[PDB]
Short mmCIF file of N, CA and C in Angstrom, two decimals:
data_model
loop_
_atom_site.label_atom_id
_atom_site.label_comp_id
_atom_site.label_asym_id
_atom_site.label_seq_id
_atom_site.Cartn_x
_atom_site.Cartn_y
_atom_site.Cartn_z
N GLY A 1 -4.60 15.76 -19.48
CA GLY A 1 -6.00 15.76 -18.97
C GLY A 1 -6.14 15.08 -17.62
N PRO A 2 -7.35 14.65 -17.24
CA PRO A 2 -7.59 13.99 -15.95
C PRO A 2 -6.73 12.75 -15.73
N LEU A 3 -6.31 12.11 -16.82
CA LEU A 3 -5.48 10.92 -16.73
C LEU A 3 -4.03 11.23 -17.08
N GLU A 4 -4.04 5.82 -25.82
CA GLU A 4 -2.95 6.50 -25.13
C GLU A 4 -2.45 5.66 -23.95
N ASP A 5 -1.22 5.92 -23.54
CA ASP A 5 -0.58 5.20 -22.44
C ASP A 5 -1.26 5.40 -21.10
N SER A 6 -1.69 6.62 -20.81
CA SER A 6 -2.35 6.87 -19.54
C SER A 6 -3.70 6.18 -19.48
N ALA A 7 -4.37 6.10 -20.63
CA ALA A 7 -5.68 5.46 -20.72
C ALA A 7 -5.54 3.95 -20.50
N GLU A 8 -4.61 3.34 -21.23
CA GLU A 8 -4.39 1.91 -21.11
C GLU A 8 -3.94 1.56 -19.69
N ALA A 9 -3.16 2.44 -19.07
CA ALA A 9 -2.67 2.22 -17.70
C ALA A 9 -3.82 2.06 -16.71
N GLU A 10 -4.83 2.92 -16.82
CA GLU A 10 -5.99 2.84 -15.93
C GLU A 10 -6.74 1.54 -16.14
N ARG A 11 -6.85 1.11 -17.40
CA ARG A 11 -7.56 -0.13 -17.70
C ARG A 11 -6.85 -1.32 -17.06
N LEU A 12 -5.52 -1.30 -17.10
CA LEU A 12 -4.72 -2.36 -16.50
C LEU A 12 -4.89 -2.32 -14.98
N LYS A 13 -4.89 -1.11 -14.42
CA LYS A 13 -5.07 -0.94 -12.98
C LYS A 13 -6.43 -1.48 -12.58
N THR A 14 -7.44 -1.16 -13.38
CA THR A 14 -8.79 -1.62 -13.10
C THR A 14 -8.82 -3.15 -13.05
N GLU A 15 -8.16 -3.78 -14.02
CA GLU A 15 -8.10 -5.23 -14.08
C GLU A 15 -7.40 -5.72 -12.82
N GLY A 16 -6.35 -5.00 -12.43
CA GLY A 16 -5.62 -5.36 -11.23
C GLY A 16 -6.56 -5.38 -10.05
N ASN A 17 -7.40 -4.35 -9.93
CA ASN A 17 -8.35 -4.29 -8.84
C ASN A 17 -9.30 -5.49 -8.88
N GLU A 18 -9.74 -5.87 -10.09
CA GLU A 18 -10.64 -7.01 -10.26
C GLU A 18 -9.98 -8.29 -9.76
N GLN A 19 -8.68 -8.42 -10.00
CA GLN A 19 -7.93 -9.59 -9.58
C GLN A 19 -7.85 -9.64 -8.06
N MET A 20 -7.69 -8.47 -7.44
CA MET A 20 -7.62 -8.39 -5.98
C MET A 20 -8.90 -8.95 -5.38
N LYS A 21 -10.04 -8.56 -5.96
CA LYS A 21 -11.34 -8.99 -5.49
C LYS A 21 -11.51 -10.51 -5.43
N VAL A 22 -10.90 -11.22 -6.37
CA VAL A 22 -11.00 -12.68 -6.37
C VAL A 22 -9.75 -13.29 -5.76
N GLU A 23 -9.00 -12.47 -5.04
CA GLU A 23 -7.79 -12.90 -4.35
C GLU A 23 -6.69 -13.50 -5.21
N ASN A 24 -6.62 -13.09 -6.47
CA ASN A 24 -5.54 -13.58 -7.32
C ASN A 24 -4.51 -12.45 -7.26
N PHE A 25 -3.72 -12.45 -6.19
CA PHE A 25 -2.73 -11.42 -5.94
C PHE A 25 -1.54 -11.43 -6.89
N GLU A 26 -1.21 -12.59 -7.44
CA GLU A 26 -0.10 -12.67 -8.38
C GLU A 26 -0.51 -11.93 -9.65
N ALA A 27 -1.74 -12.18 -10.10
CA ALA A 27 -2.24 -11.51 -11.30
C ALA A 27 -2.35 -10.00 -11.04
N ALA A 28 -2.85 -9.63 -9.87
CA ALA A 28 -2.98 -8.23 -9.49
C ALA A 28 -1.63 -7.51 -9.57
N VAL A 29 -0.60 -8.15 -9.02
CA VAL A 29 0.74 -7.59 -9.04
C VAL A 29 1.18 -7.38 -10.49
N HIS A 30 0.84 -8.33 -11.36
CA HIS A 30 1.21 -8.21 -12.76
C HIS A 30 0.54 -7.01 -13.44
N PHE A 31 -0.77 -6.86 -13.28
CA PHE A 31 -1.46 -5.74 -13.90
C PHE A 31 -1.04 -4.38 -13.38
N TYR A 32 -0.84 -4.25 -12.08
CA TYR A 32 -0.41 -2.97 -11.54
C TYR A 32 0.98 -2.68 -12.10
N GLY A 33 1.79 -3.72 -12.25
CA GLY A 33 3.12 -3.56 -12.79
C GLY A 33 3.06 -3.01 -14.21
N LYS A 34 2.11 -3.51 -14.99
CA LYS A 34 1.92 -3.06 -16.37
C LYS A 34 1.46 -1.61 -16.39
N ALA A 35 0.58 -1.26 -15.45
CA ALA A 35 0.07 0.11 -15.37
C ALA A 35 1.22 1.07 -15.06
N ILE A 36 2.12 0.62 -14.20
CA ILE A 36 3.28 1.41 -13.79
C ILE A 36 4.25 1.62 -14.96
N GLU A 37 4.38 0.62 -15.83
CA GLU A 37 5.27 0.73 -16.97
C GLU A 37 4.79 1.83 -17.92
N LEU A 38 3.47 1.95 -18.04
CA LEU A 38 2.86 2.95 -18.91
C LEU A 38 2.79 4.34 -18.30
N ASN A 39 2.42 4.42 -17.02
CA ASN A 39 2.31 5.70 -16.32
C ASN A 39 2.74 5.55 -14.86
N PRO A 40 4.05 5.67 -14.59
CA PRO A 40 4.58 5.55 -13.23
C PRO A 40 4.37 6.77 -12.34
N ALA A 41 3.63 7.76 -12.83
CA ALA A 41 3.38 8.97 -12.06
C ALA A 41 2.07 8.93 -11.30
N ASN A 42 1.50 7.74 -11.17
CA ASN A 42 0.25 7.61 -10.42
C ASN A 42 0.54 6.82 -9.15
N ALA A 43 0.47 7.50 -8.02
CA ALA A 43 0.74 6.89 -6.72
C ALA A 43 -0.14 5.68 -6.41
N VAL A 44 -1.38 5.71 -6.91
CA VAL A 44 -2.33 4.62 -6.69
C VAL A 44 -1.81 3.25 -7.13
N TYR A 45 -1.13 3.20 -8.28
CA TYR A 45 -0.62 1.92 -8.79
C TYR A 45 0.35 1.27 -7.82
N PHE A 46 1.21 2.09 -7.23
CA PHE A 46 2.20 1.62 -6.28
C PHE A 46 1.53 1.17 -4.99
N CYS A 47 0.64 2.01 -4.48
CA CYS A 47 -0.07 1.70 -3.25
C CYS A 47 -0.89 0.43 -3.40
N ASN A 48 -1.51 0.25 -4.57
CA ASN A 48 -2.32 -0.93 -4.81
C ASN A 48 -1.45 -2.18 -4.97
N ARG A 49 -0.31 -2.06 -5.64
CA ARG A 49 0.56 -3.22 -5.78
C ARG A 49 1.15 -3.59 -4.42
N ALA A 50 1.44 -2.59 -3.59
CA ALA A 50 1.96 -2.87 -2.26
C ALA A 50 0.95 -3.76 -1.52
N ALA A 51 -0.34 -3.46 -1.67
CA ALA A 51 -1.38 -4.26 -1.02
C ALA A 51 -1.32 -5.71 -1.50
N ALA A 52 -1.12 -5.90 -2.80
CA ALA A 52 -1.04 -7.25 -3.35
C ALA A 52 0.23 -7.93 -2.84
N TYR A 53 1.33 -7.19 -2.84
CA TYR A 53 2.60 -7.72 -2.35
C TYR A 53 2.45 -8.21 -0.91
N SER A 54 1.81 -7.40 -0.06
CA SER A 54 1.63 -7.78 1.34
C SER A 54 0.81 -9.06 1.48
N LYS A 55 -0.24 -9.19 0.68
CA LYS A 55 -1.10 -10.37 0.70
C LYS A 55 -0.27 -11.60 0.34
N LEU A 56 0.77 -11.38 -0.47
CA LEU A 56 1.64 -12.46 -0.90
C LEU A 56 2.84 -12.70 0.01
N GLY A 57 2.96 -11.91 1.07
CA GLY A 57 4.07 -12.09 1.99
C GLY A 57 5.32 -11.33 1.60
N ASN A 58 5.26 -10.61 0.49
CA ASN A 58 6.41 -9.82 0.04
C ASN A 58 6.31 -8.42 0.65
N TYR A 59 6.53 -8.34 1.96
CA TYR A 59 6.46 -7.08 2.69
C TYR A 59 7.53 -6.08 2.26
N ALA A 60 8.74 -6.57 2.00
CA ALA A 60 9.83 -5.71 1.55
C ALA A 60 9.39 -4.99 0.28
N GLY A 61 8.78 -5.74 -0.63
CA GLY A 61 8.32 -5.16 -1.88
C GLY A 61 7.24 -4.12 -1.63
N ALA A 62 6.38 -4.39 -0.66
CA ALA A 62 5.30 -3.48 -0.31
C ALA A 62 5.87 -2.17 0.23
N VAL A 63 6.89 -2.29 1.08
CA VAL A 63 7.52 -1.11 1.67
C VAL A 63 8.05 -0.18 0.58
N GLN A 64 8.74 -0.75 -0.39
CA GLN A 64 9.30 0.02 -1.49
C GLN A 64 8.23 0.72 -2.34
N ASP A 65 7.10 0.06 -2.58
CA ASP A 65 6.04 0.68 -3.37
C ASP A 65 5.36 1.81 -2.58
N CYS A 66 5.22 1.62 -1.27
CA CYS A 66 4.61 2.64 -0.43
C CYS A 66 5.51 3.87 -0.36
N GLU A 67 6.83 3.66 -0.34
CA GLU A 67 7.75 4.79 -0.29
C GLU A 67 7.57 5.63 -1.54
N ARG A 68 7.52 4.95 -2.68
CA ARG A 68 7.34 5.63 -3.96
C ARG A 68 6.00 6.37 -3.98
N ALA A 69 4.93 5.70 -3.55
CA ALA A 69 3.59 6.31 -3.53
C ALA A 69 3.55 7.55 -2.65
N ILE A 70 4.16 7.46 -1.48
CA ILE A 70 4.20 8.58 -0.56
C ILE A 70 4.99 9.75 -1.15
N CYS A 71 6.09 9.44 -1.85
CA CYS A 71 6.89 10.50 -2.46
C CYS A 71 6.16 11.16 -3.61
N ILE A 72 5.34 10.38 -4.32
CA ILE A 72 4.57 10.93 -5.42
C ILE A 72 3.43 11.78 -4.85
N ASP A 73 2.77 11.25 -3.82
CA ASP A 73 1.67 11.93 -3.15
C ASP A 73 1.81 11.83 -1.63
N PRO A 74 2.43 12.83 -1.00
CA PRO A 74 2.67 12.92 0.45
C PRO A 74 1.40 12.95 1.32
N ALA A 75 0.27 13.26 0.70
CA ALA A 75 -1.00 13.32 1.42
C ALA A 75 -1.84 12.07 1.15
N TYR A 76 -1.19 11.03 0.63
CA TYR A 76 -1.86 9.76 0.33
C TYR A 76 -1.87 8.94 1.62
N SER A 77 -2.92 9.12 2.42
CA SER A 77 -3.03 8.43 3.70
C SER A 77 -2.99 6.91 3.61
N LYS A 78 -3.61 6.35 2.58
CA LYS A 78 -3.65 4.90 2.42
C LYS A 78 -2.25 4.30 2.25
N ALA A 79 -1.35 5.05 1.63
CA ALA A 79 0.02 4.58 1.43
C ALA A 79 0.78 4.49 2.76
N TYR A 80 0.49 5.43 3.66
CA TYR A 80 1.12 5.45 4.98
C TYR A 80 0.57 4.28 5.78
N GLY A 81 -0.73 4.04 5.62
CA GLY A 81 -1.38 2.95 6.34
C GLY A 81 -0.82 1.60 5.92
N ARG A 82 -0.70 1.39 4.62
CA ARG A 82 -0.16 0.13 4.12
C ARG A 82 1.31 0.01 4.49
N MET A 83 2.01 1.13 4.56
CA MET A 83 3.42 1.12 4.93
C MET A 83 3.52 0.59 6.37
N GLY A 84 2.61 1.05 7.23
CA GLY A 84 2.61 0.60 8.61
C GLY A 84 2.38 -0.90 8.72
N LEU A 85 1.43 -1.39 7.92
CA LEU A 85 1.12 -2.81 7.93
C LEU A 85 2.30 -3.64 7.46
N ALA A 86 2.99 -3.18 6.42
CA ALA A 86 4.14 -3.93 5.90
C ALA A 86 5.28 -3.92 6.91
N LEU A 87 5.60 -2.74 7.44
CA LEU A 87 6.68 -2.61 8.42
C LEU A 87 6.39 -3.49 9.63
N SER A 88 5.15 -3.44 10.09
CA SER A 88 4.73 -4.23 11.24
C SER A 88 4.98 -5.72 10.97
N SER A 89 4.67 -6.15 9.75
CA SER A 89 4.86 -7.55 9.36
C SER A 89 6.34 -7.91 9.28
N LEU A 90 7.19 -6.90 9.21
CA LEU A 90 8.63 -7.10 9.15
C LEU A 90 9.19 -6.91 10.57
N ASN A 91 8.28 -6.85 11.53
CA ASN A 91 8.61 -6.68 12.94
C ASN A 91 9.27 -5.34 13.23
N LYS A 92 9.10 -4.39 12.31
CA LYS A 92 9.65 -3.05 12.49
C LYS A 92 8.52 -2.22 13.07
N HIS A 93 8.19 -2.51 14.32
CA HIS A 93 7.08 -1.86 15.01
C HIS A 93 7.24 -0.40 15.37
N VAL A 94 8.46 0.03 15.71
CA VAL A 94 8.66 1.43 16.04
C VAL A 94 8.34 2.27 14.80
N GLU A 95 8.95 1.91 13.67
CA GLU A 95 8.72 2.63 12.43
C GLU A 95 7.27 2.51 11.98
N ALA A 96 6.66 1.36 12.23
CA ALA A 96 5.27 1.14 11.85
C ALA A 96 4.36 2.11 12.58
N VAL A 97 4.57 2.24 13.89
CA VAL A 97 3.76 3.16 14.69
C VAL A 97 3.83 4.57 14.09
N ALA A 98 5.03 4.99 13.73
CA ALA A 98 5.21 6.32 13.15
C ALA A 98 4.33 6.50 11.92
N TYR A 99 4.31 5.51 11.04
CA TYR A 99 3.49 5.59 9.83
C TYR A 99 1.99 5.54 10.10
N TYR A 100 1.57 4.69 11.03
CA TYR A 100 0.15 4.60 11.37
C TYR A 100 -0.33 5.95 11.88
N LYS A 101 0.50 6.60 12.70
CA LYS A 101 0.13 7.90 13.25
C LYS A 101 -0.04 8.93 12.15
N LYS A 102 0.91 8.97 11.21
CA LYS A 102 0.84 9.91 10.10
C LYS A 102 -0.46 9.64 9.34
N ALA A 103 -0.70 8.36 9.06
CA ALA A 103 -1.89 7.95 8.33
C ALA A 103 -3.16 8.40 9.04
N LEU A 104 -3.17 8.28 10.36
CA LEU A 104 -4.32 8.68 11.16
C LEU A 104 -4.47 10.20 11.21
N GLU A 105 -3.36 10.93 11.18
CA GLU A 105 -3.48 12.38 11.22
C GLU A 105 -4.01 12.89 9.88
N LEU A 106 -3.95 12.04 8.86
CA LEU A 106 -4.45 12.39 7.53
C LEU A 106 -5.87 11.87 7.36
N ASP A 107 -6.11 10.65 7.84
CA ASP A 107 -7.43 10.00 7.76
C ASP A 107 -7.85 9.54 9.16
N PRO A 108 -8.15 10.50 10.06
CA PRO A 108 -8.56 10.34 11.46
C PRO A 108 -9.61 9.28 11.79
N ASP A 109 -10.62 9.14 10.93
CA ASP A 109 -11.69 8.17 11.17
C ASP A 109 -11.27 6.70 11.11
N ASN A 110 -10.46 6.36 10.12
CA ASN A 110 -10.00 4.99 9.89
C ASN A 110 -9.74 4.12 11.12
N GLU A 111 -10.63 3.15 11.33
CA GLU A 111 -10.54 2.22 12.44
C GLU A 111 -9.51 1.13 12.15
N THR A 112 -9.21 0.92 10.87
CA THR A 112 -8.23 -0.08 10.48
C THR A 112 -6.86 0.34 11.00
N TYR A 113 -6.56 1.63 10.88
CA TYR A 113 -5.28 2.18 11.34
C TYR A 113 -5.20 2.16 12.86
N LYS A 114 -6.28 2.55 13.51
CA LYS A 114 -6.32 2.57 14.97
C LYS A 114 -6.04 1.18 15.53
N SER A 115 -6.67 0.16 14.94
CA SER A 115 -6.47 -1.21 15.38
C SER A 115 -5.04 -1.67 15.18
N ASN A 116 -4.56 -1.62 13.95
CA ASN A 116 -3.21 -2.06 13.67
C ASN A 116 -2.15 -1.24 14.40
N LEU A 117 -2.49 0.00 14.75
CA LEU A 117 -1.56 0.82 15.50
C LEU A 117 -1.44 0.21 16.90
N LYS A 118 -2.58 -0.20 17.46
CA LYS A 118 -2.57 -0.80 18.78
C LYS A 118 -1.74 -2.07 18.74
N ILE A 119 -1.94 -2.89 17.70
CA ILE A 119 -1.18 -4.12 17.59
C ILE A 119 0.31 -3.83 17.54
N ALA A 120 0.70 -2.81 16.78
CA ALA A 120 2.11 -2.46 16.68
C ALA A 120 2.65 -1.98 18.03
N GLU A 121 1.86 -1.18 18.74
CA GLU A 121 2.31 -0.68 20.03
C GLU A 121 2.40 -1.81 21.05
N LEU A 122 1.52 -2.79 20.93
CA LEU A 122 1.54 -3.91 21.84
C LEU A 122 2.76 -4.80 21.56
N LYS A 123 3.02 -5.11 20.29
CA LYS A 123 4.17 -5.94 19.96
C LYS A 123 5.47 -5.22 20.27
N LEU A 124 5.41 -3.89 20.28
CA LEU A 124 6.58 -3.08 20.55
C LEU A 124 7.04 -3.17 22.00
N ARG A 125 6.10 -3.35 22.92
CA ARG A 125 6.45 -3.45 24.33
C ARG A 125 7.19 -4.75 24.63
N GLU A 126 7.17 -5.68 23.68
CA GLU A 126 7.84 -6.96 23.85
C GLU A 126 9.35 -6.89 23.59
N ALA A 127 9.77 -5.91 22.80
CA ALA A 127 11.18 -5.74 22.46
C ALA A 127 12.05 -5.23 23.61
N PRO A 128 13.37 -5.48 23.53
CA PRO A 128 14.32 -5.06 24.56
C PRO A 128 14.89 -3.66 24.28
#
């Protein structure tokens, strides 16, 4: 159906979102992880956990979740955007720019991507 394991997974994801709102990123990571154990075929869980991972400084972990999310759903613009943010935080600005651009070609309006893309391009001119 539109989504039992799939039902419980959404409830855990929802809780995860609630944790994000109060900035309890460790708890958020836990709930998204539980949702993934039940239904790993939902790109949202990975993309959302990547966001929590990034807030916690675990950019490498965020990169891996975004890769999975993008592979599950190639038209998931938010996953490309978060990938850019994580890569950028890992000082991988060339690769970050590539992802921000993809994200923007999918979600053109997004000012968040436009801004962080500029930051990545600016930090990129500093490299040798």
